[PDB]
Scaffold this active site. Structure first.
Site, PDB file in Angstrom:
ATOM      1  N   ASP A 284       0.854  -1.182   0.000  1.00  0.00           N
ATOM      2  CA  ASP A 284       0.000   0.000   0.000  1.00  0.00           C
ATOM      3  C   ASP A 284       0.890   1.233   0.000  1.00  0.00           C
ATOM      4  O   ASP A 284       1.684   1.426   0.927  1.00  0.00           O
ATOM      5  CB  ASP A 284      -0.938   0.013   1.209  1.00  0.00           C
ATOM      6  CG  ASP A 284      -1.899   1.186   1.185  1.00  0.00           C
ATOM      7  OD1 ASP A 284      -2.354   1.559   0.083  1.00  0.00           O
ATOM      8  OD2 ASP A 284      -2.200   1.733   2.266  1.00  0.00           O
ATOM      9  N   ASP A 286       1.217   5.067   0.349  1.00  0.00           N
ATOM     10  CA  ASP A 286       0.530   6.217   0.921  1.00  0.00           C
ATOM     11  C   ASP A 286       1.406   7.457   0.769  1.00  0.00           C
ATOM     12  O   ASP A 286       1.891   8.032   1.746  1.00  0.00           O
ATOM     13  CB  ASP A 286       0.185   5.947   2.387  1.00  0.00           C
ATOM     14  CG  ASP A 286      -0.671   4.710   2.563  1.00  0.00           C
ATOM     15  OD1 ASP A 286      -1.906   4.847   2.674  1.00  0.00           O
ATOM     16  OD2 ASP A 286      -0.108   3.596   2.584  1.00  0.00           O
ATOM     17  N   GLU A 288       1.893  11.123   0.452  1.00  0.00           N
ATOM     18  CA  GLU A 288       1.118  12.299   0.825  1.00  0.00           C
ATOM     19  C   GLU A 288       1.968  13.566   0.790  1.00  0.00           C
ATOM     20  O   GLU A 288       2.675  13.862   1.752  1.00  0.00           O
ATOM     21  CB  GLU A 288       0.520  12.124   2.223  1.00  0.00           C
ATOM     22  CG  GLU A 288      -0.430  10.946   2.361  1.00  0.00           C
ATOM     23  CD  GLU A 288      -1.019  10.839   3.753  1.00  0.00           C
ATOM     24  OE1 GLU A 288      -0.937  11.827   4.512  1.00  0.00           O
ATOM     25  OE2 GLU A 288      -1.562   9.765   4.090  1.00  0.00           O
ATOM     26  N   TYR A 364     -11.696  12.764   4.072  1.00  0.00           N
ATOM     27  CA  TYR A 364     -11.770  13.377   5.391  1.00  0.00           C
ATOM     28  C   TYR A 364     -10.670  14.427   5.491  1.00  0.00           C
ATOM     29  O   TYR A 364      -9.920  14.660   4.539  1.00  0.00           O
ATOM     30  CB  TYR A 364     -11.663  12.329   6.505  1.00  0.00           C
ATOM     31  CG  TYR A 364     -10.626  11.255   6.263  1.00  0.00           C
ATOM     32  CD1 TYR A 364      -9.292  11.462   6.587  1.00  0.00           C
ATOM     33  CD2 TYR A 364     -10.985  10.029   5.719  1.00  0.00           C
ATOM     34  CE1 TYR A 364      -8.343  10.480   6.371  1.00  0.00           C
ATOM     35  CE2 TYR A 364     -10.044   9.041   5.498  1.00  0.00           C
ATOM     36  CZ  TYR A 364      -8.726   9.271   5.827  1.00  0.00           C
ATOM     37  OH  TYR A 364      -7.787   8.290   5.608  1.00  0.00           O
TER      38      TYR A 364
END
Ligand SMILES: CC(=S)N[C@H]1[C@H](O[C@@H]2[C@H](O)[C@H]3N[C@@H](C)S[C@H]3O[C@@H]2CO)O[C@H](CO)[C@@H](O)[C@@H]1O
Ligand code: NAG
Ligand code: NAG
Ligand code: NAG
Ligand code: CL
Length: 528
Positions: A284, A286, A288, A364
């Protein structure tokens, strides 16, 4: 018959990957083994030593040699437990020793017993099987949060996302960790002797060393979060576990992977990380975020990261394809992306989706306590009633992916198992408290400005609940101290379910699984 053989006493608990429970660095934490050598020695009573000697691992032959040596070394490649006997044979007959039990340990959990989840709080069966129900498990959740793997509602989960797997690096490569005291230094001492751009473990104590349930033995080969996840996959065979590489603080080394192929220093480490730790089922990513916006504002390049993000997934998918043919398993390559349109536009996911199996749309953190002026919904499906085109919504982010050609089956909507809030909200009209201005972050559970969903239910009669049926969002307010918190309730999550249902979205994922008291996860798995 030859003499009765008596196997000498010795430790027969073996491990294909040794774990040094005193080490702090990753290179000295683990010791992966090509093979393991089960050693057996015996003495002979009640007659002679026999002409030939056998070793039996289920009353079936695994060794033969000279009985004069009274010693045997057997090569074992797979984990498991079995009874070992010495069988001395000659012309007369054969004698069989008393059996002893040998344990061969490996990260596939073949030596462990199932760790079943005992239903805690309000969690109840079952699981939404035709849609993806994922959740994030925090590595640091065993401390103050006190939420080990044996508390995770795995029967109601199809994916368990382990965050986070760090990338080694010193000054300039992981400056974002310096925002948290001791977090940057913990990664340096975990990467001692290991040089930059290789995967590792941020905290080896909580990961594989800390004693937990069903892995509390003194001679336990694997403890911590990793050990429980091995036994958990046995009690939950449906469950698939993915290692989350990066996050908010650990995303800095991604921006440097435009260079030669420190990516290989990354990818080749990922390829060994997945065969060392076999209980993981893929990767995975991620990052950012691709194009800046991360925890470190100094990093960012629009069309450098956009191509690096593509090259990273293409090479990781090809690397996983080699693992699929070598191990015979299926390995997944996922990625969590931002729900900001200004950020989705940087990456072209029409090309990335042919390397990603699923996309975790982090719907979110739209609004937070970082700005006392921009008050709004932290998470929501549609635009608020008091502002009918906020572009930071789940709806606009989903359509933004759709316009690029992203399949809806590959889109996973993000659920926030927490809430961000402001305190002392002042200077407002009407009864709408988002038109005003706050004065500081609200009192939080573990970090101020963020409140777990579970504590919201405990303090529910200190606030005034309000559901925005137009935007499919919830918030609470307390005029005593001006606490205005935006979060995801059962109502808002249930509205997110149908937005996933026949917009044909893949499913739902949440952060973080420890902050839920059972209400939110049950709403995700609601069969309508
Ligand atoms: C209040 C919290 S939980 N902040 C933690 C934070 O951010 C996480 C997460 O890293 C980020 N990555 C996706 C999987 S979710 C997205 O938002 C979350 C909260 O906003 O992550 C850092 C570590 O990177 C923690 O130290 C924070 O406590
Ligand atoms: C580290 C360890 O557990 N060593 C041995 C184990 O191999 C053996 O199975 C058990 C009983 O025979 O006695 C332990 O002392
Ligand atoms: C690693 C683990 O816990 N279980 C795996 C399982 O996920 C996989 O489908 C199977 C195929 O070989 O091999 C098991 O060892
Ligand atoms: C200091 C602080 O809380 N920073 C937050 C971080 O926790 C959160 O994960 C991120 C979400 O994108 O937004 C940042 O502003
Ligand atoms: Cl060995």
């Amino acid at each position: 018959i030859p003499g009765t053989p008596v196997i000498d006493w010795a430790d027969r608990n073996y491990a294909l990957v040794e774990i040094n429970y005193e080490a702090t660095a990753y290179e000295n934490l683990i010791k992966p083994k090509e093979q393991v050598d089960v050693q057996v020695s015996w003495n002979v009573w009640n007659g002679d030593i026999g002409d030939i000697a056998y070793v039996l691992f289920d009353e079936q032959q695994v060794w033969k040699g000279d009985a004069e040596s009274k010693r045997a070394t057997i090569k074992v490649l797979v984990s498991g437990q079995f009874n070992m006997r010495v069988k001395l044979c000659n012309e007369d007959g054969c004698s069989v020793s008393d059996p002893v039990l040998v344990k061969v340990a490996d990260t596939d959990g073949g030596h462990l017993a199932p760790l079943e989840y005992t239903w805690l709080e309000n969690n109840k069966p079952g699981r939404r099987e035709d849609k993806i129900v994922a959740a994030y498990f925090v590595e640091w959740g065993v401390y103050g949060r006190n939420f080990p793997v044996d508390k995770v509602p795995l029967p109601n989960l199809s994916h368990l996302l382990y965050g986070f797997i760090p990338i080694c690096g010193g000054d300039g490569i992981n400056d974002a960790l310096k925002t948290i005291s001791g977090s940057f230094e913990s990664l340096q001492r975990s990467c001692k002797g290991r040089e930059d751009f290789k995967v590792a473990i941020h905290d080896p104590w909580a990961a594989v060393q800390k004693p937990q349930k069903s892995v509390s033995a003194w001679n336990e080969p694997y403890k911590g979060n990793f050990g429980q996840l091995m036994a958990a996959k046995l009690a939950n065979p449906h469950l698939k576990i993915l290692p989350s590489i990066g996050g908010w603080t650990l995303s800095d080394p991604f921006y440097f992977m435009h260079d030669v192929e420190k990516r290989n220093v990354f990818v080749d480490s990922v390829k060994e990380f997945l065969q060392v730790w076999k209980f993981f089922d893929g990767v995975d990513v991620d990052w950012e975020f691709p194009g800046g916006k991360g925890a470190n504002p100094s990093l960012g390049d629009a069309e450098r990261d956009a191509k690096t993000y593509i090259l990273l997934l293409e090479e990781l998918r090809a690397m996983l394809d080699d693992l699929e043919a070598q191990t015979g398993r299926v390995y997944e390559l996922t990625s969590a992306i931002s729900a900001g349109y200004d950020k989705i536009a940087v990456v072209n996911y029409a090309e990335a989706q042919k390397s990603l199996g699923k996309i975790f749309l982090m719907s979110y953190d739209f609004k937070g306590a970082w700005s006392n002026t921009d008050l709004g919904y932290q998470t929501t499906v549609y635009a608020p009633s008091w502002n009918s085109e906020e572009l930071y919504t789940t709806h606009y982010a989903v359509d933004a992916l759709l316009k690029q050609g992203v399949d809806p089956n590959k889109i996973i909507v993000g659920v926030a198992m927490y809430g961000r809030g402001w305190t002392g909200v002042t200077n407002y009209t009407n009864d709408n408290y988002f038109s005003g201005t706050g004065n500081g972050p609200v009192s939080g559970t573990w970090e101020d400005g963020v409140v777990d969903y579970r504590q919201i239910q405990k303090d529910l009669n200190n606030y005034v609940y309000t559901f925005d049926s137009a935007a499919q969002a919830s918030y609470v307010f307390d005029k005593s101290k001006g606490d205005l918190i935006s979060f995801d309730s059962v109502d808002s999550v249930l509205g997110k379910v149908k937005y996933v249902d026949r917009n044909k979205l893949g499913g739902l994922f949440a952060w973080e699984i420890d902050a839920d008291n059972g209400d939110l996860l049950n709403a995700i798995n609601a069969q309508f």
